[PDB]
Amino acid sequence: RFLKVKNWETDVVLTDTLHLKSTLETGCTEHICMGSIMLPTKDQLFPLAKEFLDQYYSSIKRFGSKAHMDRLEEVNKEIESTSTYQLKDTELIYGAKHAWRNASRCVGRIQWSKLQVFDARDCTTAHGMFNYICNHVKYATNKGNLRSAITIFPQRTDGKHDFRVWNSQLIRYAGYKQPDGSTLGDPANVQFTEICIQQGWKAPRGRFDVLPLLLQANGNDPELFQIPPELVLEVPIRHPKFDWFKDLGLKWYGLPAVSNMLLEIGGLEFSACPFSGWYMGTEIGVRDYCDNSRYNILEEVAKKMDLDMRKTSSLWKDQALVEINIAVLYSFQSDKVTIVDHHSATESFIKHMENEYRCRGGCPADWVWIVPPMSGSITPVFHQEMLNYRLTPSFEYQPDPWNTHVW
Amino acid sequence: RFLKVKNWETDVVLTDTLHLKSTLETGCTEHICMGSIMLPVRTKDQLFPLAKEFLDQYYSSIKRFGSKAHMDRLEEVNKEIESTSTYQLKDTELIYGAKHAWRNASRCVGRIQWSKLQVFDARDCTTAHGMFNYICNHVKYATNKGNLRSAITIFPQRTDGKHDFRVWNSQLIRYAGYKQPDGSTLGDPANVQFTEICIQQGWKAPRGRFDVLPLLLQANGNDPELFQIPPELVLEVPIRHPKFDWFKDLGLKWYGLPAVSNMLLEIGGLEFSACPFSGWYMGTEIGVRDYCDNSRYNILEEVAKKMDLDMRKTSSLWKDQALVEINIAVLYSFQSDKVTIVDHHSATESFIKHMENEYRCRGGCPADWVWIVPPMSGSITPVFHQEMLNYRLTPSFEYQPDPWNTHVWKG
Numbered sequence: 171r172f173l174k175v176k177n178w179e180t181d182v183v184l185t186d187t188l189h190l191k192s193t194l195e196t197g198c199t200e201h202i203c204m205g206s207i208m209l210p211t212k213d214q215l216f217p218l219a220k221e222f223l224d225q226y227y228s229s230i231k232r233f234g235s236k237a238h239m240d241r242l243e244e245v246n247k248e249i250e251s252t253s254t255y256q257l258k259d260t261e262l263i264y265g266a267k268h269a270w271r272n273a274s275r276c277v278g279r280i281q282w283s284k285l286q287v288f289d290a291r292d293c294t295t296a297h298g299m300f301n302y303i304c305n306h307v308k309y310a311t312n313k314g315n316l317r318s319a320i321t322i323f324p325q326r327t328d329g330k331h332d333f334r335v336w337n338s339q340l341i342r343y344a345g346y347k348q349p350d351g352s353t354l355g356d357p358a359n360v361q362f363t364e365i366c367i368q369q370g371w372k373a374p375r376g377r378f379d380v381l382p383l384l385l386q387a388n389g390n391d392p393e394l395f396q397i398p399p400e401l402v403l404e405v406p407i408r409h410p411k412f413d414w415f416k417d418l419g420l421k422w423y424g425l426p427a428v429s430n431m432l433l434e435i436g437g438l439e440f441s442a443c444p445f446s447g448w449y450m451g452t453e454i455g456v457r458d459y460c461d462n463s464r465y466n467i468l469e470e471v472a473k474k475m476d477l478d479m480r481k482t483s484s485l486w487k488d489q490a491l492v493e494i495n496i497a498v499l500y501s502f503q504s505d506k507v508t509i510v511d512h513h514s515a516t517e518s519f520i521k522h523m524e525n526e527y528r529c530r531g532g533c534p535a536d537w538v539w540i541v542p543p544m545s546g547s548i549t550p551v552f553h554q555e556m557l558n559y560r561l562t563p564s565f566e567y568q569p570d571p572w573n574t575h576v577w
Numbered sequence: 578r579f580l581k582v583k584n585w586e587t588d589v590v591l592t593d594t595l596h597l598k599s600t601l602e603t604g605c606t607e608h609i610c611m612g613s614i615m616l617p618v619r620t621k622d623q624l625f626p627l628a629k630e631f632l633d634q635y636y637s638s639i640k641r642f643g644s645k646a647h648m649d650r651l652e653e654v655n656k657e658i659e660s661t662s663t664y665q666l667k668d669t670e671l672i673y674g675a676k677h678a679w680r681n682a683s684r685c686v687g688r689i690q691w692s693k694l695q696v697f698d699a700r701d702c703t704t705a706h707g708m709f710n711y712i713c714n715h716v717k718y719a720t721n722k723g724n725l726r727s728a729i730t731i732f733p734q735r736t737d738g739k740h741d742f743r744v745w746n747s748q749l750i751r752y753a754g755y756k757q758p759d760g761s762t763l764g765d766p767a768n769v770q771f772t773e774i775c776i777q778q779g780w781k782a783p784r785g786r787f788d789v790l791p792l793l794l795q796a797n798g799n800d801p802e803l804f805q806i807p808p809e810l811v812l813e814v815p816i817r818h819p820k821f822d823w824f825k826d827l828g829l830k831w832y833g834l835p836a837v838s839n840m841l842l843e844i845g846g847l848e849f850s851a852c853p854f855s856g857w858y859m860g861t862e863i864g865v866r867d868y869c870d871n872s873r874y875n876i877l878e879e880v881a882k883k884m885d886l887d888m889r890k891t892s893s894l895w896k897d898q899a900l901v902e903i904n905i906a907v908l909y910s911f912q913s914d915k916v917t918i919v920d921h922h923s924a925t926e927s928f929i930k931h932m933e934n935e936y937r938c939r940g941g942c943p944a945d946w947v948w949i950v951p952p953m954s955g956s957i958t959p960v961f962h963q964e965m966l967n968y969r970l971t972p973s974f975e976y977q978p979d980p981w982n983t984h985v986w987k988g
């Protein structure tokens with residue numbers, strides 16, 4: 171029950187013990203592995219609080235202290251009375267950093283302890299949320315010198331007063347259907363783009379229309395807000411070699427900020443907690459441009475390269491996929507916007523793994539998601555065995571609000 | 578209990594019932610996933626259920642379940658087990674078994690072909706020379722002058738585990754690897770240890786960058802013996818590039834026939850420890866792994882240099898750029914010489930069709946996403962966005978320990 175993981179490129183073997191602290195379930199069983207599947211009261215709550223507080227006071231080398239037992243009793247009494255409890259700032263910051271630390275699918279976690287936590291638990295309105303989000307975006311962006319951050323809105327109470335950011339990301343481009351049949355803008359967002367228009371948004375109808383924010387406070391109806399353009403840093407996409415690349419009329423936003431997940435800490439549920447870092451190149455160029463259910467500009471690009479698109483055997487898709495990705499990195503780098511390539515990030519992650527096996531006894535990791543979506547086997551994480559398990563605090567999926575929210 | 582998988586590119590959803598037939602274990606638990614772990618003398622006690630289950634499968638497939646033929650056969654195998662502590666498969670059973678071991682190979686992207694397998698029955702074989710002969714005929718048949726044909730050759734099953742047939746090579750055709758005094762490696766780095774064993778066993782190494790290794794063959798638990806495959810049987814393809822004329826001067830070539838020989842075939846409880854099988858290459862198996870993996874030929878740098886790439890920072894993606902050209906060359910070379918190869922786009926598309934057809938007619942298709950997704954350009958192939966259930970069905974191909982670690986040396 172003390173598990174080894176082997177890197178088959180270097181024969182380096184790490185032993186995992188951290189997994190024995192895992193609580194939540196994987197979805198797998200002895201007879202079936204689900205590793206490639208996308209998605210997975212008062213009595214319940216106090217063990218959850220205790221587990222969290224126990225790891226907190228251990229991490230500050232005050233396990234078993236009067237401070238520890240006092241805090242434990244304090245929360246216990248607050249629960250039995252108020253049927254919930256509140257985190258101290260220290261615990262709030264610790265929890266958020268560790269939800270990222272434990273995010274098994276994230277290749278970026280070497281940075282995990284350098285996270286800026288914004289406490290928005292005093293927030294009461296959509297307008298308020300807009301202010302907090304604007305401040306988040308501006309701080310994180312930092313004129314291209316991106317900084318990781320999370321903003322945390324009030325915890326769930328009874329599921330009727332949830333704070334929700336309805337956008338999947340704070341910054342994303344609109345996608346509109348054409349009567350012609352195809353898709354203008356960005357196809358991933360077509361339903362949300364409709365919802366916004368369905369909610370009173372005036373669509374500029376371009377390719378790169380920044381979506382409005384659709385914020386829900388205290389469980390009320392959500393509200394549209396237009397992010398100040400001056401806060402949305404964008405990079406024009408050009409190629410260092412192909413001058414015709416500029417002509418394609420492509421750009422992307424510098425700030426990846428996922429806003430639809432739920433942050434769980436010591437049993438408490440933060441349904442609104444937008445968090446952001448900086449892009450790995452492939453997230454935009456491999457997925458956001460070349461996925462079939464996305465921009466799918468591959469064909470167009472290959473044409474301009476005058477590649478033989480008659481047989482798949484020419485690997486024209488591959489060749490084009492590469493140039494596109496060379497351009498993304500070039501464009502961001504030239505504009506002094508933070509970006510990391512997939513070789514650098516994966517090299518960092520292997521180092522981070524070594525650190526976590528060393529100082530923590532392991533590191534939950536989801537190979538299916540850690541391996542970049544291109545050039546997989548020439549990155550060091552490919553030949554790296556990984557163990558995937560669920561630690562807490564954590565980021566979780568949650569239903570789309572429009573499937574739930576009673577209007 | 579029914580289970581669903583979703584293709585997130587097409588929103589196509591399929592339902593798996595076949596997983597209920599799963600006997601063996603994944604390595605996973607409710608609290609841990611070992612999905613990316615490479616690898617996570619049997620008595621009459623547990624052998625007859627294993628036999629019965631197989632024969633139940635077999636007779637279901639031929640629509641004779643519960644027939645007199647089915648029951649008698651059960652009886653015949655039963656009495657044969659309790660009398661001899663093992664049993665023999667009929668020829669029909671052996672062929673069915675071998676095909677379904679491939680069909681059940683959750684890590685194999687090429688399974689659309691599983692029903693077209695040429696089974697060579699080598700169970701009457703008794704010596705290493707006899708093994709050499711069977712293997713030569715396999716190679717000749719499978720190669721078919723470049724128009725490749727899937728085949729497997731099956732040597733006698735394990736008895737007490739002291740009389741194993743083994744092919745000590747990991748593949749029937751593979752290039753030598755030589756560690757040099759200065760720490761550098763001549764040839765395929767992946768084969769150094771095996772090359773050394775061979776040399777020790779009396780092999781005379783030509784010590785070139787592309788020496789075909791000799792066969793090292795073990796029959797009936799005896800010490801293995803060295804044989805040289807006749808060169809006219811080993812079909813090789815010089816690697817050149819369609820636009821880059823300097824690519825030929827890298828002096829690269831590869832062999833045409835991928836034939837894996839160190840795995841164990843399990844059928845109805847019986848263990849076939851020597852069972853070499855071959856099909857044909859997916860382009861990336863040579864171009865990405867066999868040339869560009871840092872623990873292999875690793876010509877990435879040289880190809881990059883010759884392309885005059887910016888190799889200063891990784892964010893130029895010179896590595897990615899070279900990799901594509903190398904795979905372009907590999908496919909180019911094979912197609913030009915009319916040697917069967919498939920590119921990773923064609924093969925993953927084929928597999929998705931295979932999978933869908935298997936969910937409808939069989940109730941599922943076990944698949945290992947970690948291994949099915951190609952090692953370059955993953956997300957622009959349709960398997961990347963395809964959810965997959967992994968579980969172990971029998972008959973199957975299994976790993977087994979390297980023979981030189983377990984073998985008792987006679988002399």
Ligand code: HEM
Pocket residue numbers: 270273275276277278279281285318319320445446447448449450453510515539565
């Ligand atoms: C700072 C630079 C960062 C980089 C380069 C990075 C990289 C990545 C990448 C490439 C993915 C794969 C996602 C996909 O392909 O769709 C991912 C997933 C993820 N990231 Fe990071 N990340 C960073 C920061 C952060 C931060 C600050 C957080 C939270 C505080 C975070 C939490 C997550 C989570 C929870 C997932 C997986 C979500 C899921 O289960 O679907 N990341 N990350």
Ligand code: HEM
Pocket residue numbers: 679682684685686687688690694727728729854855856857858859862919924948974
């Ligand atoms: C005919 C065309 C075939 C193609 C294109 C093909 C392709 C592949 C590829 C690319 C892999 C991954 C290998 C790696 O990355 O190391 C694989 C695995 C595998 N193949 Fe197929 N294969 C073919 C035929 C066959 C045949 C004829 C058999 C057996 C009768 C077979 C059995 C297997 C098995 C058992 C694995 C998994 C090996 C493991 O678990 O380590 N394949 N195949």
Ligand SMILES: CNCc1cc(C#N)cc(OCc2ccc3c(C)cc(N)nc3c2)c1
Pocket residue numbers: 426427428430431445446447448449450453567568
């Ligand atoms: C749709 N794909 C599945 C998917 C679903 C959900 C949900 N619910 C969230 C997803 O976020 C991946 C992610 C999250 C945070 C990131 C940060 C901070 C930085 C970065 N560079 N990349 C990131 C990628 C992905």
Ligand SMILES: CNCc1cc(C#N)cc(OCc2ccc3c(C)cc(N)nc3c2)c1
Pocket residue numbers: 835836837839840854855856857858859862976977
């Ligand atoms: C060390 N690498 C992992 C590895 C270990 C072992 C073991 N033990 C076997 C391996 O075979 C994968 C395989 C097997 C058969 C194949 C056939 C017939 C055709 C083809 N094109 N590719 C194939 C690939 C790979």
Ligand SMILES: C[C@H](O)[C@H](O)[C@H]1CNc2nc(N)[nH]c(=O)c2N1
Pocket residue numbers: 206207208538539540541585961962963964965
């Ligand atoms: C079907 C498949 O499991 C699913 O599309 C996953 C696979 N791996 C991934 N890996 C990353 N990094 N991001 C993704 O969206 C996905 N998608």
Ligand SMILES: C[C@H](O)[C@H](O)[C@H]1CNc2nc(N)[nH]c(=O)c2N1
Pocket residue numbers: 178552553554555556612613614615947948949950
């Ligand atoms: C650690 C990891 O599981 C291991 O390196 C696997 C990953 N996926 C693979 N996939 C294929 N097709 N072939 C391989 O050799 C591997 N290696």
Ligand SMILES: [Zn+2]
Pocket residue numbers: 198202203204205605609610611612
């Ligand atoms: Zn699993």
